[PDB]
């Protein structure tokens, strides 16, 4: 089997990108943030604390034939930007872009913090990192990934994220239509639950390239680039005016600026991020002060390809026996 759907810029930043799921029978369809950072399908709901929901799309199982409660089973989720959600567990029938999945972990949310009320654009997460980061208690759920993982004609899916548009994702086949020049795989480490890589280094616009090794992983609900310290200084040292803000939380630079490139390694093979990809707008409404797209990953512990570095890539998560990444041009 396969599936293809598409997934949207939840706005004009592309802060995050939903897809559409659809969960139970009939099907109830939740726009879903695609997230290779987590192993979690978790989902506002009719069980959700009605003052933290503010224009969500619900799952309601008990209109859902297909849907069971899984006794005795909770979850509890925090993530790095300091957001968290919990609750209970149903098991459903969840499908993507036509792949179907039955009895599939629906996580349902009883609490969600405020940054999740306030995105009226995400109606949940589903996590495509491996299922040993999966948060149930006592039995531990798998992915829909893992989930679908035998039946798929091959034991991939794929990311093909757009820059201010929509873009893909594949399960089970790679479009070979999608890309330019030919797809470079390097290794993955799960040993943290994650698709953890070494880039082999980076260049800054026309500079020469640095060979360095550079373990992170890739991170489809992570909005920004997350890198070593020095690598970032080096980018924004290229920048007229751009400085780490303490109070705003980051490097800003003004928004008269053109912002280089940014390429990073794989392999032998090389991946470039446009400069425009390195500009989040206004710190605030009105300002001429812009967020950048490239921060310090000190104090993370961890470098987050995210979506800045995502997007420019074709990217292949290949769930092979030994898994491993794989990143072309396009």
Do not use: M
């Not at 993530?79 to 999945?101: A, E, F, I, K, W």
């Not at 040292?237 to 390429?263: D, E, I, M, N, R």
């Not at 921060?295 to 995210?306: T, V």
């Amino acid at each position: 089997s396969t599936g293809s759907a598409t997934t949207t810029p939840i706005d004009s930043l592309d802060d995050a990108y939903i897809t559409p799921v659809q969960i139970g029978t009939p099907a109830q369809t939740l726009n879903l943030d695609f997230d290779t950072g987590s192993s979690d399908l978790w989902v506002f709901s009719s069980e959700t604390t009605a003052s933290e929901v503010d224009g969500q799309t619900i799952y309601t199982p008990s209109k859902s034939t297909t849907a069971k409660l899984l006794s005795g089973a909770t979850w509890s989720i925090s993530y790095g930007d300091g957001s968290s959600s919990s609750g209970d567990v149903y098991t459903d029938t969840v499908s993507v872009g036509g792949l179907t999945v039955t009895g599939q972990a629906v996580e349902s949310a009883k609490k969600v913090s405020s940054s999740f009320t306030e995105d009226s654009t995400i109606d949940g997460l589903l996590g495509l990192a491996f299922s040993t980061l999966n948060t149930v208690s006592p039995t531990q759920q798998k992915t829909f990934f893992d989930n679908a993982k035998a039946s798929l004609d091959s034991p991939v899916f794929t990311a093909d994220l757009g820059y201010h548009a929509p873009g893909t994702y594949n399960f089970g086949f790679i479009d070979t239509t999608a890309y330019t020049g030919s797809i470079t795989y390097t290794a993955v480490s799960t040993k943290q639950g994650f698709w953890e890589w070494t880039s082999t280094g980076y260049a800054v616009g026309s500079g020469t390239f640095k060979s360095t090794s550079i373990d992170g992983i890739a991170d489809t609900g992570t909005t920004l680039l997350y890198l070593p310290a020095t690598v970032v200084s080096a980018y924004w040292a290229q920048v007229s005016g751009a400085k780490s803000s303490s109070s705003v939380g980051g490097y800003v630079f003004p928004c008269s600026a053109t912002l280089p490139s940014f390429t990073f390694g794989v392999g032998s093979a090389r991946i470039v991020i446009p400069g425009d990809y390195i500009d989040f707008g206004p710190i605030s409404t009105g300002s001429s002060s812009c967020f950048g797209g490239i921060q310090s990953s000190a104090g993370i512990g961890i470098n987050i390809f995210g979506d800045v570095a995502l997007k420019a890539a074709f990217v292949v998560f290949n769930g092979a026996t030994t898994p491993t990444l794989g990143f072309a041009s396009k």
